[PDB]
């Protein structure tokens, strides 16, 4: 089975850890979520801040964390799952009042030669909040502290905030930031947090996140 969607198609009902083998890749263990909508591969999970997400490029490429806790699956593993197929990306956010927000977007994910760029159509970029995207869409590379792809020679958005992320602007979102339970002193501190601006605000530190992918 190439991915969780394929596991679902052959009748697996249980969410949990399963072996998959995408085209041209060795086998590896993923977290599958089996839903009414089919099978989803969990690529990111955070809830308690037990796992350090401030990691360099090779950690974000290969993956890190606890498969039974907080983790980042790894961009090379995610890309072997998607290939160049159109893919559904689900984003699940939870605030400290226990409110939840489920978002879903169609995306393409480029390979390492694109710096694992998220490739969005202009309508989908509009859904994320862009009114300044040409009809051909938008391409946002991944960046880490040691491999920042922001075009300014005095700008390192990954080093200024924390973690690795598709930082197009440095103010839309960062689900891989520093985990916080409350308000810190330094204003330069909450800015490094786990945030999704259009839901709870630039400076609201989210309590839990989940990112899931489903090819096609």
Short mmCIF file of C-alpha atoms in Angstrom, two decimals:
data_model
loop_
_atom_site.label_atom_id
_atom_site.label_comp_id
_atom_site.label_asym_id
_atom_site.label_seq_id
_atom_site.Cartn_x
_atom_site.Cartn_y
_atom_site.Cartn_z
CA UNK A 1 0.00 0.00 0.00
CA UNK A 2 1.40 3.37 -1.11
CA UNK A 3 -0.34 5.48 1.55
CA UNK A 4 -3.16 5.60 4.11
CA UNK A 5 -5.82 6.32 1.45
CA UNK A 6 -4.85 3.02 -0.22
CA UNK A 7 -4.95 1.25 3.14
CA UNK A 8 -8.48 2.60 3.58
CA UNK A 9 -9.40 1.40 0.09
CA UNK A 10 -8.45 -2.21 0.93
CA UNK A 11 -10.60 -2.02 4.05
CA UNK A 12 -8.45 -0.88 6.98
CA UNK A 13 -10.75 0.85 9.49
CA UNK A 14 -8.43 1.60 12.40
CA UNK A 15 -6.49 4.80 12.93
CA UNK A 16 -2.93 4.17 14.08
CA UNK A 17 0.53 3.20 12.86
CA UNK A 18 0.85 1.35 9.56
CA UNK A 19 3.58 0.43 7.10
CA UNK A 20 3.34 2.02 3.66
CA UNK A 21 5.65 1.95 0.65
CA UNK A 22 5.20 4.79 -1.85
CA UNK A 23 6.44 4.47 -5.42
CA UNK A 24 10.23 4.36 -5.48
CA UNK A 25 10.67 4.62 -1.71
CA UNK A 26 11.63 2.17 1.05
CA UNK A 27 8.80 1.19 3.43
CA UNK A 28 8.12 3.39 6.42
CA UNK A 29 5.66 3.68 9.28
CA UNK A 30 2.99 6.42 9.20
CA UNK A 31 0.10 7.54 11.37
CA UNK A 32 -3.15 6.93 9.48
CA UNK A 33 -6.49 8.56 10.25
CA UNK A 34 -9.43 6.64 8.77
CA UNK A 35 -12.43 8.97 8.40
CA UNK A 36 -15.73 9.23 6.56
CA UNK A 37 -13.58 11.00 3.93
CA UNK A 38 -11.23 8.01 3.47
CA UNK A 39 -7.66 7.60 4.76
CA UNK A 40 -5.45 10.54 5.73
CA UNK A 41 -1.73 10.50 6.48
CA UNK A 42 -0.87 12.59 9.54
CA UNK A 43 2.24 14.65 8.72
CA UNK A 44 2.32 16.89 11.81
CA UNK A 45 0.90 16.60 15.33
CA UNK A 46 1.37 18.85 18.39
CA UNK A 47 -0.55 19.11 21.72
CA UNK A 48 1.80 19.35 24.72
CA UNK A 49 5.16 20.84 23.69
CA UNK A 50 7.08 17.73 24.71
CA UNK A 51 8.98 17.70 21.39
CA UNK A 52 11.43 20.37 20.19
CA UNK A 53 10.44 21.72 16.77
CA UNK A 54 13.30 24.24 16.38
CA UNK A 55 15.34 22.04 14.05
CA UNK A 56 17.51 22.52 10.95
CA UNK A 57 16.74 21.60 7.35
CA UNK A 58 17.83 17.96 7.42
CA UNK A 59 15.60 17.28 10.43
CA UNK A 60 12.60 18.77 8.62
CA UNK A 61 13.44 16.75 5.51
CA UNK A 62 13.79 13.42 7.36
CA UNK A 63 11.23 13.86 10.16
CA UNK A 64 11.49 13.96 13.94
CA UNK A 65 9.57 13.39 17.15
CA UNK A 66 7.50 10.63 18.75
CA UNK A 67 5.22 8.58 16.44
CA UNK A 68 2.90 8.07 19.44
CA UNK A 69 3.14 11.74 20.48
CA UNK A 70 4.17 15.02 18.84
CA UNK A 71 5.98 14.67 15.52
CA UNK A 72 6.89 15.97 12.08
CA UNK A 73 6.64 13.18 9.51
CA UNK A 74 9.35 14.57 7.21
CA UNK A 75 9.13 16.47 3.94
CA UNK A 76 10.86 13.80 1.84
CA UNK A 77 8.39 11.22 3.14
CA UNK A 78 5.43 13.54 2.52
CA UNK A 79 6.65 14.24 -1.02
CA UNK A 80 7.12 10.53 -1.75
CA UNK A 81 3.46 10.14 -0.74
CA UNK A 82 2.14 13.01 -2.87
CA UNK A 83 4.54 12.85 -5.77
CA UNK A 84 3.38 15.61 -8.09
CA UNK A 85 -0.26 14.62 -7.59
CA UNK A 86 -2.85 17.16 -6.54
CA UNK A 87 -3.38 16.58 -2.82
CA UNK A 88 -5.84 17.53 -0.10
CA UNK A 89 -4.21 19.16 2.92
CA UNK A 90 -6.23 19.24 6.14
CA UNK A 91 -5.28 21.56 9.00
CA UNK A 92 -6.86 21.10 12.44
CA UNK A 93 -6.36 23.73 15.15
CA UNK A 94 -7.43 23.77 18.80
CA UNK A 95 -7.47 26.77 21.12
CA UNK A 96 -7.21 26.76 24.91
CA UNK A 97 -11.01 26.91 25.30
CA UNK A 98 -11.20 23.56 23.51
CA UNK A 99 -12.57 25.13 20.33
CA UNK A 100 -11.51 23.42 17.11
CA UNK A 101 -11.10 24.68 13.55
CA UNK A 102 -10.86 22.26 10.62
CA UNK A 103 -9.52 23.67 7.35
CA UNK A 104 -8.93 21.93 4.04
CA UNK A 105 -7.09 23.04 0.88
CA UNK A 106 -6.00 21.43 -2.37
CA UNK A 107 -2.25 21.82 -2.92
CA UNK A 108 0.72 20.49 -4.80
CA UNK A 109 3.98 19.78 -2.99
CA UNK A 110 7.27 20.14 -4.83
CA UNK A 111 10.39 18.09 -4.24
CA UNK A 112 13.60 19.17 -2.54
CA UNK A 113 14.70 20.91 -5.75
CA UNK A 114 11.85 23.38 -5.06
CA UNK A 115 12.75 23.54 -1.35
CA UNK A 116 9.53 21.53 -0.88
CA UNK A 117 7.38 24.37 -2.18
CA UNK A 118 3.67 24.44 -1.48
CA UNK A 119 2.12 25.18 -4.88
CA UNK A 120 -1.28 26.88 -4.69
CA UNK A 121 -3.77 27.94 -7.32
CA UNK A 122 -4.92 31.54 -7.09
CA UNK A 123 -8.39 30.52 -5.76
CA UNK A 124 -6.78 28.47 -2.98
CA UNK A 125 -4.34 31.28 -2.21
CA UNK A 126 -7.40 33.51 -1.95
CA UNK A 127 -8.93 31.09 0.55
CA UNK A 128 -5.76 31.42 2.64
CA UNK A 129 -6.14 35.21 2.52
CA UNK A 130 -4.26 36.41 -0.59
CA UNK A 131 -5.70 39.17 -2.81
CA UNK A 132 -2.31 39.70 -4.52
CA UNK A 133 -1.75 36.41 -6.43
CA UNK A 134 -1.70 36.34 -10.25
CA UNK A 135 -4.02 33.90 -12.04
CA UNK A 136 -1.11 31.44 -12.28
CA UNK A 137 -1.02 30.96 -8.51
CA UNK A 138 1.60 31.07 -5.81
CA UNK A 139 4.64 28.99 -4.85
CA UNK A 140 5.92 29.11 -1.26
CA UNK A 141 9.19 27.34 -0.34
CA UNK A 142 9.91 25.73 3.01
CA UNK A 143 12.49 27.45 5.22
CA UNK A 144 14.50 26.57 8.30
CA UNK A 145 17.01 28.64 10.35
CA UNK A 146 19.97 27.15 8.43
CA UNK A 147 18.23 27.22 5.02
CA UNK A 148 16.06 30.32 4.74
CA UNK A 149 14.51 31.15 1.37
CA UNK A 150 13.34 34.68 2.09
CA UNK A 151 14.72 36.95 -0.61
CA UNK A 152 16.08 39.68 1.74
CA UNK A 153 19.84 39.44 2.66
CA UNK A 154 18.96 40.72 6.21
CA UNK A 155 15.84 38.58 6.72
CA UNK A 156 15.75 35.12 8.30
CA UNK A 157 12.10 34.54 9.22
CA UNK A 158 12.80 30.99 10.52
CA UNK A 159 15.62 32.32 12.77
CA UNK A 160 13.47 35.34 13.84
CA UNK A 161 10.50 33.07 14.76
CA UNK A 162 11.18 29.34 15.38
CA UNK A 163 10.85 26.01 13.60
CA UNK A 164 10.51 25.28 9.91
CA UNK A 165 7.54 26.41 7.85
CA UNK A 166 6.30 27.63 4.49
CA UNK A 167 6.97 31.24 5.54
CA UNK A 168 5.69 33.21 2.56
CA UNK A 169 5.03 36.20 4.64
CA UNK A 170 6.26 35.92 8.19
CA UNK A 171 2.78 36.72 9.54
CA UNK A 172 0.28 34.19 8.11
CA UNK A 173 0.94 31.06 10.18
CA UNK A 174 3.53 28.84 11.82
CA UNK A 175 2.28 25.55 13.24
CA UNK A 176 5.89 24.49 13.95
CA UNK A 177 6.72 27.35 16.31
CA UNK A 178 7.52 27.30 20.01
CA UNK A 179 4.90 25.70 22.26
CA UNK A 180 3.53 28.07 24.95
CA UNK A 181 0.97 27.47 27.74
CA UNK A 182 0.38 31.17 28.65
CA UNK A 183 1.63 34.76 28.07
CA UNK A 184 5.41 35.36 28.10
CA UNK A 185 7.13 38.61 29.02
CA UNK A 186 9.14 39.33 25.90
CA UNK A 187 6.95 40.57 23.03
CA UNK A 188 9.61 38.89 20.80
CA UNK A 189 8.58 35.59 22.49
CA UNK A 190 4.86 34.97 21.65
CA UNK A 191 5.88 35.98 18.11
CA UNK A 192 7.76 32.65 17.97
CA UNK A 193 4.62 30.69 18.88
CA UNK A 194 2.20 28.30 17.21
CA UNK A 195 -0.26 30.54 15.39
CA UNK A 196 -2.72 30.74 12.51
CA UNK A 197 -3.49 34.42 12.12
CA UNK A 198 -6.91 34.35 10.45
CA UNK A 199 -8.40 32.12 13.17
CA UNK A 200 -7.31 33.26 16.65
CA UNK A 201 -4.80 36.00 15.80
CA UNK A 202 -1.10 36.51 15.14
CA UNK A 203 -0.20 36.29 18.83
CA UNK A 204 -2.58 33.57 20.03
CA UNK A 205 -0.56 30.43 20.95
CA UNK A 206 -2.52 27.40 19.79
CA UNK A 207 -3.04 24.47 22.13
CA UNK A 208 -2.90 21.67 19.55
CA UNK A 209 -2.46 21.24 15.80
CA UNK A 210 -2.81 18.42 13.30
CA UNK A 211 -1.87 18.41 9.62
CA UNK A 212 -3.02 15.61 7.32
CA UNK A 213 -2.59 14.85 3.64
CA UNK A 214 -4.57 12.78 1.15
CA UNK A 215 -3.30 12.46 -2.44
CA UNK A 216 -5.72 12.99 -5.37
#
